[PDB]
Amino acid sequence: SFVGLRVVAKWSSNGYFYSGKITRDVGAGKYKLLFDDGYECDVLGKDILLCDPIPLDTEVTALSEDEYFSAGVVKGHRKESGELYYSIEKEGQRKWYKRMAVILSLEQGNRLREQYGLG
Amino acid sequence: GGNSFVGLRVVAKWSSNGYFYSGKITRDVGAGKYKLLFDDGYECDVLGKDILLCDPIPLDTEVTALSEDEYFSAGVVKGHRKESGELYYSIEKEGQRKWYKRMAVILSLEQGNRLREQYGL
Numbered sequence: 001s002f003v004g005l006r007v008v009a010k011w012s013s014n015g016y017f018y019s020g021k022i023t024r025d026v027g028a029g030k031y032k033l034l035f036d037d038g039y040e041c042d043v044l045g046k047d048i049l050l051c052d053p054i055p056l057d058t059e060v061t062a063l064s065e066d067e068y069f070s071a072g073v074v075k076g077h078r079k080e081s082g083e084l085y086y087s088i089e090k091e092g093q094r095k096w097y098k099r100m101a102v103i104l105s106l107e108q109g110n111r112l113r114e115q116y117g118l119g
Numbered sequence: 120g121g122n123s124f125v126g127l128r129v130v131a132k133w134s135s136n137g138y139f140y141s142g143k144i145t146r147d148v149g150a151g152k153y154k155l156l157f158d159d160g161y162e163c164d165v166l167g168k169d170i171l172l173c174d175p176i177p178l179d180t181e182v183t184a185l186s187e188d189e190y191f192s193a194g195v196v197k198g199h200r201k202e203s204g205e206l207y208y209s210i211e212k213e214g215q216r217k218w219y220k221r222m223a224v225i226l227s228l229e230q231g232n233r234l235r236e237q238y239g240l
């Protein structure tokens with residue numbers, strides 16, 4: 001089963017995919033999803049991408065203070081003290097982001113759906 | 120004219136769990152409600168009573184500090200640091216202090232209620 005896997009998942013109409021983990025199979029094509037901020041709700045399998053981690057060379061959106069739409073490209077992964085960090089490139093400069101800060105727009109997530117979509 | 124709190128950073132309650140998350144007030148929307156932009160980019164209307172006008176969360180406040188696979192780890196704010204447009208909190212838990220980004224610091228209902236009289240709308 002998919003329970004216990006880390007994923008990115010879309011929960012609302014806004015359409016962005018956020019880091020979380022499948023915590024329960026709740027039937028009817030649906031999974032209980034615990035987002036990294038501690039919010040838990042049911043989501044559709046079609047709105048879950050089985051990325052852990054998001055692959056190198058993926059275009060993503062990298063959250064930081066006052067930045068809600070900052071696109072960049074994954075160029076590295078680092079595990080440190082039980083936590084995943086992404087190295088994200090934007091305009092020839094790389095910065096580190098914790099897992100929970102890396103999200104995907106609907107368009108960005110659609111690029112991964114064929115290969116990683118739970119369905 | 121203008122509502123005094125528009126554009127200010129706050130920590131605001133999410134009804135589904137009662138936890139307060141970092142965000143900002145984008146506007147007043149009447150009937151005692153405000154449009155709240157959370158740091159993850161989610162926007163929705165929130166009652167004033169569910170908003171704490173903390174920027175930053177005060178020294179010696181008990182908070183919940185998010186890290187990978189940790190959803191309920193309590194700690195205490197012992198310092199603040201702003202670098203290149205980003206606020207960090209120094210969070211003491213047991214025998215270590217560690218720096219957390221603003222959006223990783225949240226408050227349970229009980230933790231947020233301890234700030235309500237001084238900082239609540």
Ligand SMILES: CC(C)(C)NCCCNC(=O)c1cccc(Br)c1
Pocket residue numbers: 018019035036037038039063100101133140141157158159161222
């Ligand atoms: C609306 C609410 C409760 C702030 N977040 C919904 C769940 C998905 N969001 C997150 O995992 C998240 C990611 C980064 C920062 C924050 Br604040 C939250």
